[PDB]
Design an enzyme around this catalytic site. Structure first.
Site, mmCIF file in Angstrom:
data_model
loop_
_atom_site.group_PDB
_atom_site.id
_atom_site.type_symbol
_atom_site.label_atom_id
_atom_site.label_comp_id
_atom_site.label_asym_id
_atom_site.label_seq_id
_atom_site.Cartn_x
_atom_site.Cartn_y
_atom_site.Cartn_z
ATOM 1 N N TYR A 5 0.875 -1.176 0.000
ATOM 2 C CA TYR A 5 0.000 0.000 0.000
ATOM 3 C C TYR A 5 0.920 1.236 0.000
ATOM 4 O O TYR A 5 0.530 2.379 0.301
ATOM 5 C CB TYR A 5 -0.999 0.044 1.176
ATOM 6 C CG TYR A 5 -2.125 -0.977 1.209
ATOM 7 C CD1 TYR A 5 -3.125 -0.955 0.239
ATOM 8 C CD2 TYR A 5 -2.193 -1.961 2.191
ATOM 9 C CE1 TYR A 5 -4.170 -1.877 0.235
ATOM 10 C CE2 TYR A 5 -3.243 -2.881 2.210
ATOM 11 C CZ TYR A 5 -4.234 -2.834 1.225
ATOM 12 O OH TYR A 5 -5.297 -3.722 1.186
ATOM 13 N N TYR A 58 -11.626 -1.094 -1.138
ATOM 14 C CA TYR A 58 -11.616 -0.391 0.130
ATOM 15 C C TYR A 58 -10.330 0.289 0.552
ATOM 16 O O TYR A 58 -10.308 1.005 1.558
ATOM 17 C CB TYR A 58 -12.114 -1.288 1.244
ATOM 18 C CG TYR A 58 -11.023 -1.970 2.033
ATOM 19 C CD1 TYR A 58 -10.177 -2.930 1.481
ATOM 20 C CD2 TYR A 58 -10.831 -1.597 3.364
ATOM 21 C CE1 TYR A 58 -9.181 -3.510 2.279
ATOM 22 C CE2 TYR A 58 -9.874 -2.163 4.144
ATOM 23 C CZ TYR A 58 -9.050 -3.112 3.607
ATOM 24 O OH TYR A 58 -8.125 -3.601 4.494
ATOM 25 N N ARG A 59 -9.269 0.044 -0.197
ATOM 26 C CA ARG A 59 -7.986 0.634 0.122
ATOM 27 C C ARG A 59 -7.042 0.339 -1.021
ATOM 28 O O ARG A 59 -7.217 -0.625 -1.769
ATOM 29 C CB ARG A 59 -7.302 -0.099 1.290
ATOM 30 C CG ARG A 59 -7.839 0.024 2.687
ATOM 31 C CD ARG A 59 -7.107 -0.864 3.705
ATOM 32 N NE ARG A 59 -5.687 -0.649 3.973
ATOM 33 C CZ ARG A 59 -5.051 -1.297 4.950
ATOM 34 N NH1 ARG A 59 -5.713 -2.150 5.706
ATOM 35 N NH2 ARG A 59 -3.768 -1.121 5.219
ATOM 36 N N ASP A 83 -2.856 -10.490 9.904
ATOM 37 C CA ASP A 83 -1.872 -11.554 9.818
ATOM 38 C C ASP A 83 -0.510 -11.299 10.455
ATOM 39 O O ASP A 83 -0.250 -11.721 11.590
ATOM 40 C CB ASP A 83 -1.727 -11.979 8.369
ATOM 41 C CG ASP A 83 -3.054 -12.459 7.803
ATOM 42 O OD1 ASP A 83 -3.596 -13.518 8.225
ATOM 43 O OD2 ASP A 83 -3.610 -11.706 6.979
ATOM 44 N N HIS A 131 4.903 -7.195 -2.559
ATOM 45 C CA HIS A 131 3.465 -7.301 -2.565
ATOM 46 C C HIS A 131 2.696 -6.099 -3.094
ATOM 47 O O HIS A 131 3.195 -4.974 -3.075
ATOM 48 C CB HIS A 131 2.861 -8.300 -1.549
ATOM 49 C CG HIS A 131 2.842 -7.855 -0.117
ATOM 50 N ND1 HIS A 131 3.816 -7.070 0.458
ATOM 51 C CD2 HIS A 131 2.003 -8.196 0.889
ATOM 52 C CE1 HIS A 131 3.538 -6.886 1.737
ATOM 53 N NE2 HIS A 131 2.445 -7.567 2.027
#
Ligand SMILES: *Cc1cc2c(cc1C)nc1c(=O)[nH]c(=O)nc-1n2C[C@H](O)[C@H](O)[C@H](O)COP(=O)(O)OP(=O)(O)OC[C@H]1O[C@@H](n2cnc3c(N)ncnc32)[C@H](O)[C@@H]1O
Ligand SMILES: *Cc1cc2c(cc1C)nc1c(=O)[nH]c(=O)nc-1n2C[C@H](O)[C@H](O)[C@H](O)COP(=O)(O)OP(=O)(O)OC[C@H]1O[C@@H](n2cnc3c(N)ncnc32)[C@H](O)[C@@H]1O
Ligand SMILES: *Cc1cc2c(cc1C)nc1c(=O)[nH]c(=O)nc-1n2C[C@H](O)[C@H](O)[C@H](O)COP(=O)(O)OP(=O)(O)OC[C@H]1O[C@@H](n2cnc3c(N)ncnc32)[C@H](O)[C@@H]1O
Ligand SMILES: CCCCCCCc1ccc(O)cc1
Ligand SMILES: CCCCCCCc1ccc(O)cc1
Ligand SMILES: [Cl-]
Ligand SMILES: [Cl-]
Ligand SMILES: [Cl-]
Lengths: 555, 555, 555
Positions: free
Chosen positions: A103, A498-499, A165, A417
């Protein structure tokens, strides 16, 4: 320090220096840190994150990166740093942990911004209350930390922590972001109560019942506001009186958060994780349908999640350790590995909490329910190999932090990621269409599809995990292309996200354009009303202050 | 650098230094250059032009001259330099080549301005497309350059370049200026399509179809805007949709141009230059009339031009090499030299393009047509001496650049050109009156009249070539007087000028005063609306930003 | 008048009345006209157009419609009406003819606007000049009118008019719109020179050389500006000096145009229309390719056009007169009708202009060129039935106006045109893809594809003709859906549209979004700088004044 590698728009080096000079005088040299050279641009590790830029950069590594970093010692410094920022119109970009990888990590939207490391110094677990079943925390507390404090204090038998997680994240950082967790308290943002935050003008503000002041006892006299105690009800009831402003603080640049109330689940007095392997790919559909009612009906207690086969394997092993192939693995190959691993082409992990009689009863319904699916097979953690992903989630679904999960980042060589996360109905039909659309585009880009649904009451967060090697420039472009394409497609089929990562907040905010971008317009109004100078995180969620021209800034 | 010889109005040396300091940090020392002393004020050569001031100065040499020079490395620097300029209100004066001699060369209207050498670094021929028959270019490409690139690429057989005389000019610099060329594609501004330019606010903007974005392919991801590709139609159709703004960019301070689409004539598959000598001075009149219909009717394909006798001689030789006389040569002497050179007192060069049958046919009409003129004589390039001006234009009228033409600058000792250029109808009567008026004033000033008509479809650009020795101060004043007088006279007889040198943009804009200077007023409104700070080339074409008082600035 | 059926946003009936009252006092009752009732909402005929709204309404009939109409008697009234408009902030929407059907007709973007009928009173052909080969005109002159005036004056042998199809349009109205025509002078906007227009502030402004004032003779003294003569060069050279602003006046709300210079082709002294039938559907591809070089090379003189089979038939007959079928006709059926009509599945009309030798020669090249196409067949107008579309275009390609073309509007019952017009490269591959995309969407909507390519030098205007019955509400929605879809698809493949109807100016302007809508942003800046009150045609081409919120207005 002297010369940053890059700088905030519209600002002289002469200004950066006076500004930084003054900050060094306030927080002291130990706290400040200027980005002068390439050797500083290191992509860290989850265990020791880099605060200068994006670790998982789909974009150029040095694209989004700070002019400097500054760790305020406490609230007062924040207020102060804020005021200087206003004098220079220097942009701030706050962060508690820097853990937000996939992100954009600690990187700021607008380059040359000063990054506030809220976490370093404000590290404290301010309170844990057994009767209220909540605790209070500063930006510094990671999940592991809290877990330890409960454990050190022997409180772990009294109250459980909910956890995403990887247990490294900031408890509040994840909460303002509205991140997902696994126990019944899985909705993080939902579970908060009372917050404290610094406005762009540097004024303090408690929220909800946070506002009703604790009466004055002789012991509390003289305390600075930041140090003053909260009233009894502050952490127990979120609403307060009049408008409920807390939301203005989630996923937005409205202000800096300094502390926050978070609930804690009382130990349930019962627990047993479980697994149910779905044999076929298409079984995703009936599975989702079978679940819908089990969710609303409360059969399924916590936030269960349907995991793709590759996701559990990625944790078990490298793409290399399964196929020399350099392209997306075939349905055949996928069927093969599940056979090797004893998993389904889809795998539903979840849990039961309570005394045995409730547990036994629910277990029945759940087992009986999933049986309609031909070939389903139910395992308990015990019933599995000592490495199994289930033996890991068993801790996750009980508040025990871990880090076994990062292993999946390792599917390709240089792991990185990137999450695509559209929302989807709790329907076999809707979930099947979304999966197929995301998959084909993944294939188009030469990447293996990988993801997991996280089941909310009336919806599911579909989390596509884009792993890609952070060094192939070509792959990156394909990835960028991948994200951009998926966003538009899911948009064109009613699906939102959502993000997201910094490189797409702009695009994502545009999908939300009903009635001529009315939603974005209302925000900017609030934005500018609240921070005239756009000092705080401009560009977060696509919201731009009047100073940044949308032409130059959007992306 | 420290102290410029002169500086921008309303600015401290302390400011110039911070400003320049910062630019040096961006473009690096190699790129910047401050004008500290007289030894820097060198009047170059066409081959190596001076970027500090006017080479052909009618005015004092050090009158119009830069505080410094700066070569942006690419678009991004331009955007940046632009922003600093705004912080300091420092005036910029962009240029691609500096080749604009006889119109003030690289000198800025307002002294102490920073001159942007757009050409040095942005030198690239961005594209050449055979099917679209066009190419794209940066400020850096001179005509010769393009010609070579076509030739290196063996494309010269596929597409021809149109060219003004001296082949050194910037292809786009000449085009924004609306300069004339010789082939059928002689109207430069007409032949463009799609442009890119930096606004005063530093924002990028493509025009026409330039605006419709090229769809996103995986290969083009991440590219900065300046580097992004144009859509398929951009260079093929100029209009786009909504207002057609391109004109705001010709001969004006509205913005900086960075790239531009230009058409290219497909090889016509036939060619033959020709000449027709008109014996008498008065034959100019019937000649023009005979031409009028040949132009509209398409008999005459390219932009032909009627050349005065002295012009062809000047190329052949120095005034000295013909007469010890120090004053304007008599009609008798003029008749004499033409006899020596085999030319008419007027000489019509032009061309034919196409397969033989069209060529033969047109040739007939043209020859038959000009015959009414007693004593006319038709030569082909072959039919002439190996030095003849015709052997030179033969290349010009086929896109071959040359530089043989500068020789005419050499008529007097210290050569310096200065163009007077009023527009005139395609009429023998109108062209005769204009010639006579310009001539008498030339005689009054003691200079030899010299010029050439360039025939457009419905008009002719009468180009008076004022050569004068750049060292006689008296001659200069006479010259200034000359220009000022001619402007007013031609004004008083309906004649306008399509372009001029810095010292007269103000006067020329005033001739355009219908309805109380309404035209100028509308511009300034646009001007100030677009560049609040008047950062970009104030005074170009007489347009002044609100900051410059017309009293102090006009001239 | 008292109460309009609808009114301008943000305005009281009390205000409309004072405003209208005053206008009636200026132009007198004969000139004004208020829209009080439904009986006023009549959808006219091309022969007598309705000035109250859109005749071809895809949208609700009464959707876009005026609060009233007003015919200024002359320039002075325009200036005056303009000033009142400013006092009330009442929106104006100028028009010369009202003939713009298939693009919304006389209807204004924002409802309740006052429509200025510029045409009624300013009807005059101000001048026709043989030597300059141009004429000047007011908004009132239709093509037929001009043609008659040339003919009455016996000038038709001296100069030809260029004309679009239906000869009713306003010569200038079509030109500011940049409409297409058939002779070599087919580019209307290209062919203009010098304009006059009223600014939002009501001040007059001539452009180009229009600005250089005609010297004062005793005869011209006292004349009001609007009545003053233009200088000699005004209509002969478009550029003038300084910025070339004319483009700000095409397809935009920047100002009202009152007169305009337009060129006229001198009679070529030769002519012969021709036709070439392409047998197969796929032959479109090789045809386009064969043409590309013929265009650049000048083999093809005028703007030729490739016509679909249905288009020529529609002119010949009603869909009913060929098939009882209620859905798009099959490829088989299409092959059939061409056999009946002697036409190809594609048909290339065009022309030759000049003396016989040029004509003969070109004819050869053209015939020889198209031969590679198996089954091609070349007809001359004579070689065809006395109703043939060729016998009609023969006049069109020679400046003779007609109206035979409207017959195609009659394919369905209640005829209504709607043009989709994307631009396309002069390539068989590009033209084939565009055709296929437009066709399939047409089929999806249940409509027969119909269209014609109009060949420019480096591009082709693909004109999809959406005919649809103006009474089926369902069909309309499908049509709206049709347009919206096509726009996005062609966008997603690099294709733009050069013009459109009111209901889609907004959508179309958004396709032009390179660099964050930079193009639109630059316009609005100019827009607001020039018309603070947004009095003139807000919404034209999607440009909105600051007063209209994009949320409420866009569409
Ligand atoms: C790699 C990965 C990531 C991941 C995950 C599994 C893997 C293998 N599983 C996650 C999960 O189950 N649930 C979840 O929410 N996230 C998961 N992630 C992503 C990420 O690791 C976590 O979300 C993590 O919690 C994010 O990092 P952290 O919690 O440390 O947040 P941060 O680095 O501080 O960034 C926070 C953002 O919010 C704003 N912010 C932060 N602090 C403040 C303050 N004090 N005031 C105002 N705004 C603040 C900033 O905008 C910042 O960008
Ligand atoms: C001496 C001479 C000159 C001449 C000529 C024959 C002789 C013997 N024949 C010419 C001809 O046939 N046609 C013609 O147009 N010019 C002819 N000249 C004059 C001159 O040599 C040429 O016009 C030449 O092309 C001009 O110089 P150049 O092309 O290099 O232009 P420049 O030095 O860059 O100046 C351009 C002006 O336009 C504006 N400008 C330039 N670049 C920009 C950018 N990027 N953005 C915005 N504005 C720009 C400036 O205002 C500058 O003054
Ligand atoms: C039905 C049809 C239409 C058509 C056509 C064939 C058929 C069967 N063939 C055309 C062709 O070959 N070429 C072409 O350009 N158009 C063709 N059309 C469409 C239409 O009939 C014509 O384009 C026609 O010329 C348009 O109508 P008209 O010329 O009368 O224009 P208008 O009604 O006045 O509307 C003009 C628009 O431009 C602006 N405008 C107009 N006047 C002014 C003034 N004085 N000042 C400022 N702006 C002005 C307005 O915005 C108005 O909307
Ligand atoms: C099914 C196990 C989950 C492991 C990885 C979860 C990744 C993830 C979680 C939450 C987000 O908001 C985005 C991404
Ligand atoms: C006839 C040969 C031409 C040589 C010199 C042309 C000089 C010239 C050309 C164009 C201008 O805009 C101004 C001046
Ligand atoms: Cl995490
Ligand atoms: Cl030149
Ligand atoms: Cl028409």
């Amino acid at each position: 320090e002297f010369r940053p590698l890059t700088l905030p728009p519209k600002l002289s080096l002469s200004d950066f220096n006076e500004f930084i000079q003054d900050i060094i005088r306030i927080v002291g040299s130990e706290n400040v840190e200027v980005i002068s050279s390439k050797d500083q641009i290191v992509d860290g590790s989850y265990m020791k994150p880099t605060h200068t830029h994006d670790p998982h950069h789909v974009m150029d590594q040095d694209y989004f990166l700070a002019s400097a970093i500054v760790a305020p010692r406490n609230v007062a410094d924040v207020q102060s740093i804020v005021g200087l920022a206003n004098k220079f119109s220097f942009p701030l970009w706050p962060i508690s942990i820097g853990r937000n990888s996939g992100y954009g990590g600690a990187a700021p939207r607008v380059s040359g911004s000063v990054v506030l490391d809220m976490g370093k110094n404000m590290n404290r677990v301010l309170e844990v209350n057994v009767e209220g079943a909540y605790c209070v925390v500063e930006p510094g507390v990671t999940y592991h930390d809290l877990h330890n404090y409960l454990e050190a204090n022997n409180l772990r038998d009294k109250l459980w922590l909910d956890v995403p997680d990887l247990g490294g994240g900031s408890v509040l950082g994840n909460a303002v972001e509205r991140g997902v967790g696994y126990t019944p308290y899985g909705d993080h943002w939902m579970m908060h109560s009372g917050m404290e935050v610094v406005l762009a003008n540097g004024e303090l503000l408690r929220t909800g019942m946070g506002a009703l002041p604790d009466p004055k006892r002789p012991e509390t006299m003289g305390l600075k506001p930041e140090d003053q105690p909260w009233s009894k009800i502050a952490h127990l009831f979120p609403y307060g009186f009049g408008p409920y402003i807390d939301g203005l603080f989630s996923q937005s640049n409205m202000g800096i958060v300094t502390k926050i109330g978070i609930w804690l689940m009382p130990n349930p007095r019962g627990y047993q994780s479980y697994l149910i392997t779905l044999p076929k790919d298409g079984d995703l559909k009936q599975a989702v349908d079978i679940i819908r009612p089990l969710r609303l009906g409360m059969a399924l207690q916590n936030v269960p999640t349907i995991r793709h086969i590759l996701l559990d394997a990625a944790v078990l092993g490298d793409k290399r350790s399964y196929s020399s192939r350099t392209e997306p693995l075939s349905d055949e190959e996928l069927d093969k590995i599940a056979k090797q691993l004893n998993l389904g082409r889809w795998n539903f992990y979840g849990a039961l909490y309570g005394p045995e009689p409730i547990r036994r009863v629910l277990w029945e319904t759940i087992k009986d329910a999933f049986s309609a699916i031909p070939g389903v097979k139910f395992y308990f953690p015990e019933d599995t190999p000592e490495n199994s992903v289930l033996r890991v989630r068993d801790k996750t679904m009980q508040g025990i932090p871990t880090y076994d999960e990062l292993k999946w980042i390792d599917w390709l060589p240089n792991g990185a990621h990137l999450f695509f996360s559209p929302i989807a109905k709790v329907s076999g039909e809707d979930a099947m269409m979304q999966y197929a659309v995301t998959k084909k585009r993944c294939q188009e880009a030469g990447l293996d599809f990988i993801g997991t649904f996280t089941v909310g009451m009336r919806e599911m967060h579909h989390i596509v995990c884009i792993v890609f090697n952070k060094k192939d420039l070509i792959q990156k472009r394909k990835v960028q292309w991948l994200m951009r394409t998926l966003i538009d497609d899911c948009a064109a089929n009613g699906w939102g996200e959502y993000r997201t990562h910094l490189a797409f907040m702009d695009q994502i905010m545009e999908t939300y354009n009903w009635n001529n971008s009315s939603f974005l317009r209302f925000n900017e109004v609030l934005k500018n009303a609240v921070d005239p100078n756009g000092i705080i995180a401009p560009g977060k969620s696509g919201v731009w202050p009047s100073q940044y021209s949308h032409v130059t800034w959007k992306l």
